[PDB]
């Protein structure tokens, strides 16, 4: 499974969603489900550590943090918006992240975020409540994630 979140400068999520593989349509079983926000909160500190560092690209950080068989990848926009993903095995594996697919996914989701931000009524603090945004994000996950 995969757990994706978009977080602003004040360390609050403006969007959150979880993806599955369609042979085990339950997500993380019961415990990682409770632990996901906390581990993502922990990894945000490393993401902020890499935010201001010299050494090419610096928006896509790739694998930054590690946990109990969980790979954590981070992408950073220009307005400090942090895009964080947590990859989980299929109950047994050593998860390896596809560099190009994750890069392209973050690129397209950043396109979605910027064109969400453009309208007059949106504010940085407010969350991205939109059926269209969720729909296009999840079909994008089908297109690029797996």
């Amino acid at each position: 499974p995969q757990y994706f979140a978009i977080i602003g400068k004040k360390d609050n999520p403006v969007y959150e969603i979880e993806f599955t593989n369609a042979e085990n349509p339950q997500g993380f079983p019961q415990d990682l489900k409770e632990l996901n926000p906390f581990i993502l909160h922990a990894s945000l500190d490393i993401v902020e550590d890499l935010q201001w560092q010299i050494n090419t690209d610096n928006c896509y950080l790739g694998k930054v943090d590690h946990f109990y068989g969980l790979a954590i990848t981070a992408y950073i926009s220009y307005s400090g918006m942090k895009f964080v993903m947590i990859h989980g095995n299929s109950a047994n594996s050593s998860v390896v992240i596809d560099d190009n697919n994750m890069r392209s996914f973050y690129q397209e989701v950043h396109e979605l975020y910027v064109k969400t931000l453009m309208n007059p009524f949106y504010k940085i603090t407010d969350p991205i409540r939109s059926p269209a945004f969720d729909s296009r994000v999840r079909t994008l996950a089908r297109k690029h994630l797996s």
């Binding site: 059926p131 969720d134 079909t139």
Partner: protein, 210 residues
């Protein structure tokens, strides 16, 4: 109705769903569609904005703060698709670019960026003579010999020009550089409609850069 709904929390998005509710804001592209309009329309919108702002305000400081707040949001929006949109190297344009533009993280890269592309995009010409007063600790400034939005405003007072000050402030604020941007008039060089946007960074940025 499955859009985030942050009170409930994350939702289970099974990876077999391709049902698509067109939105008219997500389908439309943002490439660089040229639709240049007359300067007169901008001037009249600007002056009616300031006229409406006169009745609501009470003092000069409140007027300047509200105008800067008006420009702040335009800065919020413009940062993303001036940094992002320049990454295109000659449907969605995300899969037209092999390498995202390297986001600036230095004291002067952002100011060079504003001098070069943001001002050119806004007023169709590169800004003039970005300089810094190298005496006290930091006084960076952007000077325009003939501002476009506020050319019709008479008088020697600079209060109506805080709109672009707010734009710059929002730009640097999202980019990770809080500022105290403020405008001054420095008639020098025979133009005499010369305006200087003094930029003063916070101690946090000074500690971070060194």
């Amino acid at each position: 109705s499955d859009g985030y709904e942050y009170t409930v929390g994350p939702k289970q998005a099974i990876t077999s769903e391709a049902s698509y509710i067109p939105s008219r804001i997500y389908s439309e592209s943002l490439l660089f569609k040229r639709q240049e309009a007359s300067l007169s329309a901008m001037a009249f919108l600007f002056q009616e904005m300031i006229s409406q702002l006169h009745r609501t305000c009470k003092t000069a400081g409140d007027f300047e703060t509200k105008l800067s707040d008006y420009g702040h949001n335009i800065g919020i929006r413009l940062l993303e698709l001036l940094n992002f949109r320049a990454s295109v190297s000659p449907e969605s344009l995300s899969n037209y670019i092999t390498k995202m533009r390297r986001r600036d993280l230095k004291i002067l890269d952002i100011l060079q960026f504003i001098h070069g592309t943001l001002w050119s995009y806004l007023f169709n010409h590169v800004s003039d003579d970005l300089v810094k007063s190298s005496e006290r600790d930091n006084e960076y400034m952007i000077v325009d010999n003939f501002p476009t939005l506020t050319q019709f405003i008479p008088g020697e007072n600079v209060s109506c020009e805080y709109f672009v000050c707010g734009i710059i402030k929002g730009f640097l604020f999202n980019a990770g550089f809080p500022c105290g941007v403020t405008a001054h008039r420095m008639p020098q060089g025979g133009h005499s409609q010369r305006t200087v946007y003094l930029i003063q960074f916070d101690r946090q940025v000074l500690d971070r850069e060194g």
